[PDB]
Ligand binder design. Structure first.
Ligand SMILES: *[C@H]1O[C@H](CO)[C@@H](O)[C@H](O)[C@@H]1O
Length: 36
């Protein structure tokens, strides 16, 4: 699970894309997405 305020999967990020429960993966930019 990706941490809170962490990048959860933009184009090119194939790591922890699944946010911790309670946090939502919000795509902010095409490559920048953050678990909030
Ligand atoms: C939360 O923690 C993860 C690693 O555990 C980071 O990838 C993220 O940027 C944030 O610091």
């Amino acid at each position: 699970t990706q941490s809170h305020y962490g990048q959860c999967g933009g184009i090119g990020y194939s790591g922890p894309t699944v946010c911790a429960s309670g946090t939502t993966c919000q795509v902010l930019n095409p490559y920048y997405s953050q678990c909030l």
